[PDB]
């Protein structure tokens, strides 16, 4: 197919495969035609809603084979990451709900246990599928159940350390489970997995349904750790995607620069000025936007695969020799290198900059990818310099400030673009520990840590509030907070991070320790997992738009 | 091979001539076997004097000599994994006559440490970091045009961690010029197929105690290019027969030549056996810490429900998550400092899904001579900001058992944190019964000052409270917090004091701060806890005093605040 349908294709057989037992009723002769229907409805429905695209086109036949040959949902099927799982959803009672994909109150971006009994594990972060399936298998065995346990994992996901840990452990307990390797990013692998204790079969053609069905059949009942190697084509069945798998990894349905592009430009600009700079990403070159950097400074660019943990200790090692590494990494994925950041960087006070993207609410990918916690989990770590730029110009300057600082520094910023203010093309740092009064008013002061500043300024128009662009969580601008506490009736902290442990709480700690008893209102993300929606809707829910902030401030003021 | 530890200093005229590697490299190969025996004698003596790690260093006496003999250290970079085997390395790097200060306040640290010496390229303690660190130094040196060598020594156990696999793959990708030495002491003297497949030139296994083979092999490999993997085989406790015979007992020892209560970890382990006796669903998981966390008895009684995942904290937690999906009841036994490494798995695979998994967090707080690399300083801070977590802090043995029962019965993610060591030895109710969630326990009614204690500083706080006539609350829960008790005390007292063995920043005391601020309660608030720096190693009692967490420290802080 060469152009995505705009009208609901006719799929009479797929309308008979609404669920795995219904599908299993059909005969193998129909499976190939079913795959044409499925592929077609998928291209259609993702045209309607936008979403992940090329990877699910790659697993159409594999997903049909899997539900054909296995007794789902009693047989446990774990999809790694989940971006490839739209065919799975279409085949598990959610075909007609696909119109809701990634809309508020609609189907989630990934498999989700609460969404369907056919989803055994909520995924999004990669590489968790083997560990989870092994755990389900260890339990089924003790329970004397006879269910099967299958993980479909891609070749990128397999570069992650936890996947190695799971494969080793599965061998240790001689677990009866199947790992299917959906190899698409394409010489001689079998002996490796055999050395790890896994029975290796393959590689087989992942769009050759009769061979998939038969091979799956023989392996369904084999015992112990089984490893099937399947090969697929990303975007299979859609030429524009087969030829551009990067750009068709996700499609939007039929302003200023992105913060990540501001970072990428700062990265090239500093590299041109300082040969010490090294750029590190764990398999997120496009998203963190190291693209130009990687083309212009190839010998100083490191893609460590999906190995967040090694990315960080690697950088500690580089800094030991006087190089200046910059680890580009999303807030949600830095969760996975927390120990390397604490033990290998911060404990040694090594000179490493973390450029933390996707900080705050990330929109439709939902809570598995939210950057809700990095202020809280980093600021309790001694030695960290922790920064929250408010716009594009501030991101450029605080990156420069952290880079030049001799020690560990973190700069957090959101997905998407900003208020599109002017960016100074100089590369100069700003004073560490100092906020910027953006607005002198009275009565109530808004202490903003990050990109809600523009909403705070709108609120302060009507309330004539003081507004501060705090810039630093740690070290906090203690002298400004102390003056503001002595001259206002209310301090209001604002952040796109958990309130619990977050930046407002550092203000709170500082007020308590000096016995300053001024009222404090902490605005931030609440203590729950925010359901997927447009970014603007998640922020409105969390009260971090101008109307939410104004309502909270006015209420607190009316109560004292 | 010896059988007794020397009580006075051995005669080591050749080791006395090898006070640094440069001096060592001026000796001849024919001297090295005698140096090896003198080093071993010295090692036995000085660890007998100070206490410290023992058997693993015995295992690397010959390898350490060979390494500093063949490599141009400190210019050539040597990274020791974990570092508990690195006493022979310190003895040879200008520190021999300092080993009397080992693991003492202001003495040598437990592990290699960059600030301690130019011969330590990387601070270690946690495991499996050496290959990543050495690869980064190899990459940097090459971009700088330096011709220096990069060497990582890693034990067979550390190679079970995922980050070691991630580093072995990436080193292959960049075709790095480095040497990984696998110090394998679970084998005795096929075997390299794994490393060969990951792009590494594999050599061995060789005899890690044959200095002539070690020196010649190392010399050949020093000069080869690309990712080089040398497989060496050593014996636990080599050359000291009691440690060869009992390498668990001789992993570490006390200085040569009072009853107390049971260790918190042993209370935990008893709880685990008792609850497994009653609930066939309970499964116990440890990431290679059976002795430390103390699943020994449980492993023997319930072996089909005991899982040691090796040094694989990350997989430990996701494996629990998958177990909980089939209705089983995993308990992850994991140190606070090591749980740092599975944080993404706890957040994304457990909390986000609200799966019923219990975390028994040992080594909460300061851990003593092992130092800041192992400190359990942050787990209240990094867990309480996570939606869905039930976060508990028992004050003594009976409270620890009660709060393990409470977190288990809870259907959802729950955490119970307790320190190394033993407690104040209060009686322990043999029942298995919970307590109510989110409710503290008033231990003393006084006036003016209320001490809100999260954890095991309660006995010291009681001493202060008796001196001041203060109120004392055993809070039990950081999340959900006993908001009603806190509200009441904030109205009836002039000062609230929180005490916890965790970073003040983001800590349980800050949860009290947040609550007061959100309700507009304006009572003065003094937060006592761990300060914003890495506390240098010392006895636990000395580290607590430094931080203000003994009764003297608490009282001085409180009195000082009351004087304004
Ligand atoms: C732990 C973890 N780290 C990073 C990602 C993002 C990612 C990078 C590369 C490939 C993929 C697969 C499809 O995109 C995902 C993740 N999902 N989980
Ligand atoms: C990440 C990490 N996890 C656990 C340990 C504790 C440990 C378990 C097994 C073997 C060893 C080696 C010597 O004891 C240490 C650690 N050091 N680092
Ligand atoms: Mg892939
Ligand atoms: Mg070992
Ligand atoms: Mg011992
Ligand atoms: Na600016
Ligand atoms: Na160095």
A454 belongs to a structural domain? yes
Cβ proximity of B126 and B337 under 8 Å? yes
A93 belongs to a structural domain? yes
CA-CA distance, B81 to B168, in Å (whole number)? 14
- Residue A24 gets the label, from left (phi > 0), alpha (psi -120 to 50) or beta, of alpha
Helices (H), B234-312: 241-245, 264-278, 296-301
Rounded to whole angstroms, what are the CA distances from A84 to A63, A146, A302, A306, A404?
10, 27, 27, 17, 41
- Residue A133 gets the label, from left (phi > 0), alpha (psi -120 to 50) or beta, of alpha
Q: CA nearest A154: which of A210, A225, A239, A230? A: A230
Residue listed under structure tokens 């900001």? B385
| Bridge partners of residue B527, in order along the sequence | B498
Residues 6+ apart with CB under 8 A from A393: A421, A422, A423, A424
Q: CA nearest A314: which of B173, B64, B228, B345? A: B173
Q: What angle do CA A510, A514, A515 make, to 5 degrees?
A: 110
Q: CA nearest B499: which of B550, B545, B535? A: B550
Cβ proximity of B154 and B80 under 8 Å? no
Half-sphere exposure of A349 (CA within 13 A, CB side): 11
- E strands, B468-512, in order: 471-474, 477-479, 495-503
Residues 6+ apart with CB under 8 A from A187: none
CA-CA distance, B396 to A514, in Å (whole number)? 32
A224 known member of a binding site = no
Q: Which two tokens stand for residue B365?
A: 């707080």
Residues 6+ apart with CB under 8 A from B73: B21, B67, B93, B119
Which atom of ligand 1 lies at the shortest distance from residue A125's CA? 18
Phi, psi of B45 (to 5 degrees): -55, -55
DSSP assignment of B22-58 equals: HHHTTS-HHHHHHHHHHHHHHHHHHHHHH-EE-HHHH
Instruction: Kindly state whether residues A221 and A337 are assigned to the same domain.
Output: no
> Which helix (H) or strand (E) segment is A535 a member of?
helix A535-541
- Residue B365 gets the label, from left (phi > 0), alpha (psi -120 to 50) or beta, of left
Cβ proximity of A478 and A512 under 8 Å? no
How many CB atoms sit inside 10 A of residue A519's CB?
A: 20
First to last CA, chain B: 65
Does B136 contact A316 at a Cβ distance shorter than 8 Å? Answer: yes
Q: How far is the CA of B119 from the centre of ligand 7 (A)?
A: 7
DSSP A421: P
A408 belongs to a structural domain? yes
Q: Is B141 in CB contact (< 8 Å) with chain A?
A: yes
Lay out the sheet containing A76-79: strands in order across: A76-79, A149-154, A177-183, A225-231, A199-205
Does A332 contact B322 at a Cβ distance shorter than 8 Å? Answer: no
CA-CA distance, A439 to A422, in Å (whole number)? 18
CA-CA distance, A77 to A220, in Å (whole number)? 12
How many CB atoms sit inside 10 A of residue B527's CB?
A: 23
3-state secondary structure A174-226: CCCEEEEEEECCCCCCHHHHHHCCCEEEEEEECCCHHHHHHHHHHHHCCCCEE
Phi, psi of A132 (to 5 degrees): -65, -50
Residues 6+ apart with CB under 8 A from B11: none
A427 belongs to a structural domain? no
After which residue numbers is chain B interrupted with C–N beyond 2.5 angstroms? 189, 257
Q: Is A16 tagged catalytic? A: no
Alpha-carbon torsion (B238, B242, B243, B244), positive or negative: positive
Q: Which two tokens stand for residue B329?
A: 């009841």
Q: Is A292 in CB contact (< 8 Å) with chain B?
A: no
Cβ proximity of B488 and B413 under 8 Å? no
- Chain B residues touching A343 at Cβ < 8 A: 123, 125-126, 129, 337, 340, 373
Cβ proximity of A355 and A334 under 8 Å? no
Domain of A451? 436-558
Cβ proximity of B60 and B234 under 8 Å? yes
- Given A370, A396, A412, the domain boundary residue is A412
Show contacts of A30-37: CB within 8 Å, 24+ apart: A31/A64, A31/A65, A31/A68, A31/A209, A31/A213, A32/A209, A34/A64, A35/A60, A35/A61, A35/A64, A35/A209, A37/A9, A37/A11, A37/A12, A37/A13
CA-CA distance, B392 to B455, in Å (whole number)? 8
Cβ proximity of B65 and B234 under 8 Å? no
Q: What is the CATH number of the domain that holds A230?
A: 3.40.50.970
Phi, psi of A236 (to 5 degrees): -50, 125
Residue listed under structure tokens 């496009």? A286
Q: How many CB pairs under 8 A join A and B?
A: 336
DSSP assignment of A113-181 equals: TTT-TT--S---SSS-HHHHHHHHHHHHHHTT----EEEEEETTGGGSHHHHHHHHHHHHTT--EEEEE
Residues 6+ apart with CB under 8 A from B554: B451, B457, B460, B461, B464, B497, B499, B528, B548
B362-397 burial string, b = 16+ CB within 10 Å, else e? Answer: bbbbbbbbbbbbbbbbbbbbbbbbbbbbbbbbbbbb
DSSP assignment of A261-287 equals: HHHHHHHHHHHTT-TTEEEEESS-HHH
Residues 6+ apart with CB under 8 A from A249: A52, A53, A54, A55, A83, A234
DSSP B260: -
B435 belongs to a structural domain? no
Longest dimension (CA), chain A: 80
The experimental technique behind this entry is: X-ray
Listed resolution, Å: 2.2
Q: Is B149 tagged catalytic? A: no
CA-CA distance, A249 to A286, in Å (whole number)? 11
Rounded to whole angstroms, what are the CA distances from A238 to A42, A81, A99, A490, B78?
11, 22, 21, 58, 52
Q: C-alpha A131: how far from its chain's center?
A: 19
| Bridge partners of residue B334, in order along the sequence | B361
**Of these residues, A234, A236, A396, A397, which one is catalytic?**
A234
User: Using CB atoms and an 8 Å cut-off, which of residues 379-408 of chain B contact chain A?
Assistant: 381-382, 384-388
Instruction: Kindly state whether residues A226 and A172 are assigned to the same domain.
Output: yes
Determine whether A35 is exposed, middle or buried from the number of CB atoms within 10 Å of its CB (0-12, 13-18, 19+): buried
Does B114 contact A320 at a Cβ distance shorter than 8 Å? Answer: yes
Instruction: Kindly state whether residues A126 and A96 are assigned to the same domain.
Output: yes
Strand A301-303 vs strand A490-498: parallel, antiparallel, or unpaired?
unpaired
C-beta of B341 in contact with ligand 2 (< 6 A): yes
CA-CA distance, B540 to B419, in Å (whole number)? 10
Q: From B53, B123, B127, give the residue whose CB has the most ligand 2 atoms within 8 Å, as the site to mutate.
A: B127
CA-CA distance, A392 to A413, in Å (whole number)? 9
| Cα dihedral value B109, B114, B118, B122, nearest 10 | 110
Instruction: Kindly state whether residues A466 and A398 are assigned to the same domain.
Output: no
Q: Which two tokens stand for residue B23?
A: 């001096």
Lay out the sheet containing B471-474: strands in order across: B441-444, B471-474, B449-454, B495-503, B525-530
Rounded to whole angstroms, what are the CA distances from B12 to B34, B42, B262?
9, 8, 42
Radius of gyration of the CA atoms of chain A, in A: 26
Residues 6+ apart with CB under 8 A from B303: none
CA-CA distance, B196 to B217, in Å (whole number)? 18
- Chain A residues touching B382 at Cβ < 8 A: 338, 376-377, 380, 501
A125 belongs to a structural domain? yes
What is the length of chain B? 564
Instruction: Kindly state whether residues B235 and B277 are assigned to the same domain.
Output: no
CA-CA distance, A503 to A524, in Å (whole number)? 9
Does A138 contact B323 at a Cβ distance shorter than 8 Å? Answer: yes
Say how many domains are in chain B.
3
CA-CA distance, A263 to A370, in Å (whole number)? 20
Residues 6+ apart with CB under 8 A from B470: B444, B446, B447, B448, B449, B450, B451, B464, B558
Cβ proximity of B332 and B356 under 8 Å? no
> Which helix (H) or strand (E) segment is B509 a member of?
helix B508-518
DSSP B210: -
Three-state secondary structure call for residue A443: coil
Phi, psi of A193 (to 5 degrees): -65, -35
Instruction: Kindly state whether residues A93 and A198 are assigned to the same domain.
Output: yes
DSSP B154: E
Q: Which two tokens stand for residue A159?
A: 């570069």
Angle between helices B130-143 and B162-173 (to 10 degrees): 20
Half-sphere exposure of B342 (CA within 13 A, CB side): 34
| Cα dihedral value A260, A526, A80, B171, nearest 10 | 50
Cβ proximity of A134 and B322 under 8 Å? yes
- E strands, B282-368, in order: 282-286, 306-308, 329-335, 358-362
Instruction: Kindly state whether residues B273 and B244 are assigned to the same domain.
Output: no
CA-CA distance, B164 to B169, in Å (whole number)? 9
- Given B370, B401, B417, the domain boundary residue is B417
DSSP assignment of B364-388 equals: -B--STT-GGG-B-SHHHHHHTSTT
Cβ proximity of A124 and A109 under 8 Å? yes
Cβ proximity of B292 and B338 under 8 Å? no
The alpha carbon of residue B18 is apart from the nearest alpha carbon of chain A, in Å, by 27
Q: Is B236 tagged catalytic? A: yes
C-beta of B288 in contact with ligand 2 (< 6 A): yes
Determine whether A96 is exposed, middle or buried from the number of CB atoms within 10 Å of its CB (0-12, 13-18, 19+): exposed
Q: Is B106 in CB contact (< 8 Å) with chain A?
A: no
How many CB atoms sit inside 10 A of residue A1's CB?
A: 15
- Given A352, A378, A412, the domain boundary residue is A412
Instruction: Kindly state whether residues A74 and A120 are assigned to the same domain.
Output: yes
Does B162 contact A159 at a Cβ distance shorter than 8 Å? Answer: no
A373-390 burial string, b = 16+ CB within 10 Å, else e? Answer: bbbbbbbbbbbbbbbbbb
Determine whether B55 is exposed, middle or buried from the number of CB atoms within 10 Å of its CB (0-12, 13-18, 19+): buried
Does A522 contact B517 at a Cβ distance shorter than 8 Å? Answer: yes
3-state secondary structure B394-413: CCCHHHHHHHHHHHHHCCCC
Cβ proximity of B109 and B371 under 8 Å? yes
After which residue numbers is chain A interrupted with C–N beyond 2.5 angstroms? 186, 254
Cβ proximity of A524 and A502 under 8 Å? yes
Q: Which two tokens stand for residue A287?
A: 């998203």
- Chain B residues touching A278 at Cβ < 8 A: 139-140, 143
- Residue A366 gets the label, from left (phi > 0), alpha (psi -120 to 50) or beta, of left
Half-sphere exposure of A420 (CA within 13 A, CB side): 4
Instruction: Kindly state whether residues A383 and A468 are assigned to the same domain.
Output: no
Instruction: Kindly state whether residues A319 and A183 are assigned to the same domain.
Output: no
Q: What is the CATH number of the domain that holds A546?
A: 3.40.50.920
Radius of gyration of the CA atoms of chain B, in A: 26
Q: How far is the CA of B236 from the centre of ligand 4 (A)?
A: 8
Q: CA nearest A209: which of A68, A19, A15? A: A68
> Which helix (H) or strand (E) segment is B313 a member of?
helix B313-325
DSSP assignment of A44-62 equals: HHHHHH-EE-HHHHHTHHH
The alpha carbon of residue B525 is apart from the nearest alpha carbon of chain A, in Å, by 5
Q: What angle do CA A520, A523, A525 make, to 5 degrees?
A: 145
Three-state secondary structure call for residue B524: coil
Instruction: Kindly state whether residues B322 and B238 are assigned to the same domain.
Output: no
A9 belongs to a structural domain? no
How many CB atoms sit inside 10 A of residue A515's CB?
A: 12
CA-CA distance, B160 to B300, in Å (whole number)? 23
Which of A168, A309, A335 minimises the CB distance to B166?
Answer: A309
Instruction: Kindly state whether residues B243 and B287 are assigned to the same domain.
Output: no
B425 belongs to a structural domain? no
CA-CA distance, A520 to B522, in Å (whole number)? 9
């Amino acid at each position: 197919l060469h152009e995505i349908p705009r009208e609901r294709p006719a799929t009479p057989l797929l309308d008979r495969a609404s669920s795995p037992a219904e599908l299993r009723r059909l005969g193998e002769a129909d499976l190939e035609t079913l795959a044409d229907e499925l592929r077609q409805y998928l291209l259609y429905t993702v045209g309607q809603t936008g979403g992940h695209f090329g990877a699910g086109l790659g697993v159409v036949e594999l997903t049909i084979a899997l539900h054909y040959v296995f007794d789902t949902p009693d047989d446990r099927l774990v999809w790694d990451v989940g971006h490839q799982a739209y065919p799975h959803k279409i085949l598990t009672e959610r075909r007609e709900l696909m119109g809701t994909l990634r809309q508020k109150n609609g189907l989630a971006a990934f498999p989700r246990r609460a969404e369907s009994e056919y989803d055994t594990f909520g995924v999004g972060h990669s590489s968790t599928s083997i560990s989870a399936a092994l755990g389900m298998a260890i339990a089924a065995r003790l329970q004397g159940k006879e269910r099967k346990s299958v993980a479909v994992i891609g070749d990128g996901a397999l570069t992650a350390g936890m996947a190695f840990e799971a494969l080793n452990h599965a061998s240790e307990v001689d677990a009866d489970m199947l790992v299917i390797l959906n190899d698409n990013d394409m010489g001689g692998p079998g002996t490796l997995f055999e050395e790890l204790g896994w029975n290796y079969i393959g590689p087989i053609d992942g769009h050759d349904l009769p061979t998939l069905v038969a091979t799956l059949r023989n392996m369904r009942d084999m015992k112990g750790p089984q490893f099937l190697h399947v090969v697929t084509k990303k975007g299979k069945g859609f030429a524009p995607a087969e030829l551009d798998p990067i750009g068709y990894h996700a499609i939007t349905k039929l302003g200023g620069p992105k913060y990540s592009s501001v970072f990428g430009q700062w990265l090239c600009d500093m590299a041109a000025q300082d040969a010490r700079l090294l750029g590190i990403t764990p398999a997120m070159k496009e998203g963190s936007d190291l693209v130009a950097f990687s083309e212009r400074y190839p010998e100083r660019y490191f893609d460590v695969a999906i190995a967040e943990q090694h990315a960080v200790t690697l950088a500690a090692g580089m800094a030991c020799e006087g190089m200046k590494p910059v680890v580009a990494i999303y807030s949600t994925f830095l969760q996975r290198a927390y120990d390397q950041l604490i033990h290998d960087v911060a404990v040694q006070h090594l000179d490493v900059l973390f450029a933390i993207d996707r900080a705050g609410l990330v929109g439709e990918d939902g809570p598995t990818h939210a950057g809700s916690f990095d202020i809280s989990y980093l600021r309790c770590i001694p030695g960290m310099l922790v920064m929250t730029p408010s716009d594009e110009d501030e991101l450029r300057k605080l990156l420069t400030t952290g880079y030049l600082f001799d020690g560990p520094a973190a700069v957090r910023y959101p997905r998407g673009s900003g208020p599109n203010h002017p960016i100074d093309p100089d590369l100069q740092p700003v004073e560490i520990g100092k906020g910027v009064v953006r607005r002198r008013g009275g009565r109530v002061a808004l202490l903003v840590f990050g990109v809600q500043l523009a909403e705070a300024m709108k609120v302060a128009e009507s309330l004539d509030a003081t507004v501060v662009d705090m810039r630093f969580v740690k070290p906090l601008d203690e002298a400004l907070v102390r003056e503001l506490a002595g001259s206002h009736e209310l301090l209001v902290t604002i952040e796109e991070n958990a309130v619990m442990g977050g930046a407002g709480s550092a203000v709170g700690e500082f007020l308590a320790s000096e016995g300053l008893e001024v009222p404090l209102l902490q605005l931030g993300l609440p203590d729950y997992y925010v359901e997927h929606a447009k970014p603007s809707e998640m922020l409105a829910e969390c009260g971090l738009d101008a109307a939410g902030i104004e309502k909270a401030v006015r209420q607190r003021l009316d109560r004292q």
